[PDB]
Design a binder for these strands. Structure first.
Ligand SMILES: [Zn+2]
Ligand SMILES: [Zn+2]
Lengths: 248, 51, 47, 107, 186, 209
RNA sequence: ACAGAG
DNA sequence: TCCAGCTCCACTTAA
DNA sequence: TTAAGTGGAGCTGGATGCTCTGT
């Protein structure tokens, strides 16, 4: 049911601090000045996010102009205050005008690489179950959030699958993705052709392109390399290295 | 002819909005410390605004 | 700086967007026309 | 917020003096002592709530002696009020009725 | 920094957030009723929209030329300096000025009555300045300070400068090209 | 939280047990089937539960080859582990005369510490794992085939059956996740059992290089 | 160097 | 008109 | 305090369909 989907969607989909705060305000007092953020805890309670004032202190202090943990206070469950400090590098203490546009865009919850996520619905009569579609580029993180079945998630991107699951899962993804694209345009190819293409791309342990850079890692012959692209550079390198070319 | 008006207006110094510590510095930058033959500001502070 | 921002626009979000550009010129010593023209002079490619 | 000097019209910066925090010009002696609380509220845009309440959410606004919905004339319906944008918006009222052989959405 | 931060199901009380927020910034050090601490109420800093100068405090629609002239006649008998823009040529001849059908300006005419100003029903305003009637409309609403000043070089090297008053409203006069053309089309 | 943090310390421990079992270390049936509500008994919630030195493993002896060949698993608490903490774990490992260890870092490892693991000794080999990799057993993922580390007496038949040299086989990197999982080193061969579209199977081979 | 053809 | 390598420069760890 | 290994940003050099048919 959908109530479980929206929880784990909210664990991967990025939300910014500004998206959950009903206002942010600068306060200037005679004794001190600070920036204050009040969290809209009603909207937290609906979106089923596991964040509060004590967590927002941990969303800040990471990669934000070396702000100190002491400078951030959690005076109530709904409020946070960020006491500004001198940047002491190409800046003026008036850096509040930087934070007032930057502090909302800090990420409090979720995965930073995920731009959005959507719930998808099946239409078969036998069943109804919800799969989650993630438009983003961190496969490892989505494999490791509580409540995603990590053994059955997949990716379009062969580089992500290689970095996360190894060369043999990347090899299957080249097969699946070429065949998916061919079937949609109503073409059909015997599986043995896309199989051979993927095995040529992965036999040296790394996913090598069909570009000039991949071909230079696969092919040893100078005259083969010089008869495709960069015809000058390959011939001067063979002169320098004194390479001998198999005419095979 | 070629109408170009200039005005000079006096700003007071006993009102709280004048930071005299900074006013002494800016007047010392503009005028040499004790010369006063030609000088934009007669007193040790920035007395005047020119328009 | 006021007459510049008057021309660019006086809505709050237009001022917020232009804000970091005032904060650049105030870091340099450029407060006067002659100082600004000197700055441009040291950037001109000589023909 | 941008605040500008009455004298020369350069941009003010906030600094600290010996008795108060001050707005101060960089190019003229003008300073303005912050004597009392001054503030500036951003009010940013919140998330959409449309697909968040659908599908038997954890609503709670129902109360004893609540009105019946106008079509079915039974109290088998939930009602709620929420801000759709930031909290300066006047809250909107919305309600949904779910009964046997009867599905509807109303305003 | 401890990462495994803990949370609970309980619902925040509305006043409890309000009164916590209240106690965070309602503190005031205004007790210093002293000269330095004091502040001049007529030299506040300028908030950027000039109609909206007051950012700190002790605690619009557009007018039309029928309304402007009605306020200065009935509601307030005080005199006020308008500033008006006329067309490039008035419907006159330069009197004996040694010409060529050259432009006619207010500098060429002589003192006296020059015309009549009519307010009509439905807010139409006309400046009847001869046989012809010119239309009058409100100009851009300036809200910076404007001063109307005399300069008189009463001597070869010295003279008097005198401020006669502030200027608030601008009027634009233009020819009614539709009426001029509906007389004799082309 | 505290519900979520214990969940990781159960899933990470569960995967390390299956990793040690697949490498051929002696693992007991009650370690592999340790249930979440059963994990709560020896070590409970976060105040009682200790991460740096309670969940450590050393019972793992290489029961196939020899009971003296033994391996640690360590769970540091600092997200970026410096050389100091490595030296701490190394001298404890030096005292016990254990030669293998796993270090399970929480966010990462600082560059000067990473360089140490290459050169501390060839006879003291330590493998970095990020815990974010151990929350999902990749050997049970649907895209990963069955890998089987071949014996030298079987590699000598592979090369005899096709009349190959070793350097004509396809390659697999040592930096591959599934190569790290089985802990294989340069010059070992892995058998890979790819599933067919039919009931059948296709067998392929790769060389670590 | 431009236009064509499939 | 689009895209991999190469080099310069700030940014933490570590002694 | 600083030696050094590695992040992030700008510069540079490469590539972009097959043929006949005429001026
Ligand atoms: Zn000023
Ligand atoms: Zn109903």
């Amino acid at each position: 049911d959908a109530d479980y989907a929206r929880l784990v969607k909210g664990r991967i989909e990025k939300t910014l601090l500004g998206e959950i705060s009903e206002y942010i305000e600068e306060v200037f007092l005679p004794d001190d000045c600070f920036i204050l953020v009040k969290l809209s805890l009603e909207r937290i309670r609906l979106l089923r996010l596991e964040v509060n004032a004590e967590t927002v202190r941990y969303s800040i202090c990471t990669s934000k102009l070396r702000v100190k943990p002491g400078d951030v206070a959690v005076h109530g469950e709904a409020v946070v205050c960020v006491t500004p400090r001198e940047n002491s590098k190409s800046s003026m203490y008036y850096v509040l005008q930087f934070l007032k546009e930057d502090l909302p865009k800090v990420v409090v919850q979720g995965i930073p690489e995920v731009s959005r996520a959507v719930i998808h619905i099946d239409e078969q009569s036998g069943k109804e179950k919800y799969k989650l579609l993630v438009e983003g580029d961190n496969l490892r993180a989505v494999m490791a959030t509580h409540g995603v079945k990590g053994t059955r998630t997949t990716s379009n991107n062969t580089y992500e699958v290689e970095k996360t699951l190894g060369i043999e899962a990347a090899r299957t993804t080249i097969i699946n993705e070429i065949q998916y694209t061919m079937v949609n345009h109503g073409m059909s190819i015997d599986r043995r052709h896309v199989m051979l293409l993927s095995d040529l791309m992965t036999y040296k342990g790394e996913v090598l392109g069909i570009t000039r850079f991949g071909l230079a890692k696969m092919k040893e012959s100078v005259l083969m390399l010089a008869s495709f692209e960069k015809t000058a550079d390959h011939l001067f390198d063979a002169a320098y290295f004194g390479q001998k070319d198999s005419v095979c | 002819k070629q109408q170009k008006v200039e005005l000079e207006m006096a700003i007071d110094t006993l009102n709280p909005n004048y930071c005299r510590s900074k006013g002494e510095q800016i007047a010392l930058n503009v005028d040499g410390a004790c010369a006063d033959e030609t000088s934009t500001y007669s007193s040790k502070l920035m007395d005047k605004q020119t328009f | 700086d006021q007459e510049i921002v008057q021309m660019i626009g006086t809505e709050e979000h237009v001022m917020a967007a232009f804000g970091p550009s005032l904060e650049e010129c105030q870091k340099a010593q450029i407060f006067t026309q002659m100082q600004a023209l000197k700055y441009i002079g040291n950037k001109v490619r000589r023909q | 917020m941008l605040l500008f000097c009455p004298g020369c019209g350069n941009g003010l910066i906030v600094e600290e003096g010996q008795r108060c925090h001050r707005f101060s010009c960089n190019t003229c002696p003008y300073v303005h002592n912050i004597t009392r609380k001054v503030t500036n509220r951003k009010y940013p845009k919140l998330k959409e709530v449309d697909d968040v309440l659908g599908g038997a959410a954890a609503w709670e606004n129902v109360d004893s002696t609540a009105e019946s919905c106008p079509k079915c004339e039974h109290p088998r319906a939930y009602f709620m009020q929420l801000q759709t944008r930031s909290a300066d918006e006047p809250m909107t009222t919305f309600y949904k009725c779910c009964n046997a052989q009867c599905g509807h959405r109303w305003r | 920094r401890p990462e495994v931060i803990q949370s609970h199901s309980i619902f925040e009380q509305g006043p409890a957030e309000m009164m916590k927020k209240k106690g965070n910034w309602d503190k005031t050090v205004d007790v210093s009723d002293m000269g330095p601490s004091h502040i001049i109420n007529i030299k506040k800093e300028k908030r950027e929209t000039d109609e909206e100068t007051k950012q700190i405090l002790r605690m619009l629609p557009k007018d039309v030329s029928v309304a402007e002239l009605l306020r200065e006649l009935s509601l307030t008998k005080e005199e006020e300096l308008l500033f008006l823009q006329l067309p490039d040529t008035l419907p006159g001849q330069p009197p004996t000025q040694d010409i060529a059908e050259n432009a006619c300006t207010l500098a060429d005419l002589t003192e006296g009555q020059v015309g009549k100003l009519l307010i009509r029903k439905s807010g139409r305003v006309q400046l009847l300045l001869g046989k012809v009637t010119l239309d009058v409309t409100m100009g851009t609403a300036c809200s910076f300070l404007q001063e109307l000043v005399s300069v008189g070089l009463g001597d070869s090297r010295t003279g008097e400068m005198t401020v006669l008053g502030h200027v608030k409203h601008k009027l634009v006069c233009s020819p009614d090209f539709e009426s001029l053309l509906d007389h004799k089309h082309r | 939280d505290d519900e979520e943090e214990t969940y990781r310390l159960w899933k990470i421990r569960k995967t390390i047990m299956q990793l040690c079992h697949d490498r051929g270390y002696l693992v007991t049936q009650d370690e592999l089937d340790q249930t979440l509500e059963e994990f709560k008994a020896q070590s409970g919630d976060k105040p009682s539960e200790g991460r740096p030195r309670r969940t450590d493993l050393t019972v793992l002896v290489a029961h196939n080859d020899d009971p003296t060949d033994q391996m640690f698993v360590f769970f540091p608490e600092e997200p970026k582990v410096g050389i100091k903490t490595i030296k701490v774990y190394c001298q404890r490992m030096q005292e016990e005369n254990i030669t293998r260890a796993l270090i399970v870092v929480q966010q990462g490892m600082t560059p000067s510490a990473k360089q140490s693991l290459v050169d501390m000794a060839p006879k003291y080999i330590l493998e970095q794992f990020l815990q974010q990799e151990l929350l999902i057993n990749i050997t049970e993922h649907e895209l990963v085939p069955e890998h089987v580390v071949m014996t030298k007496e079987e590699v000598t038949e592979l090369l005899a059956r096709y009349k190959l040299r070793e350097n004509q086989l396809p390659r697999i990197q040592a930096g591959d996740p599934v190569a790290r999982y089985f802990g294989i080193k340069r010059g070992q061969v892995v058998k890979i059992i790819r599933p067919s579209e039919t009931a059948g199977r296709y067998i392929t081979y790769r060389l670590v290089q």
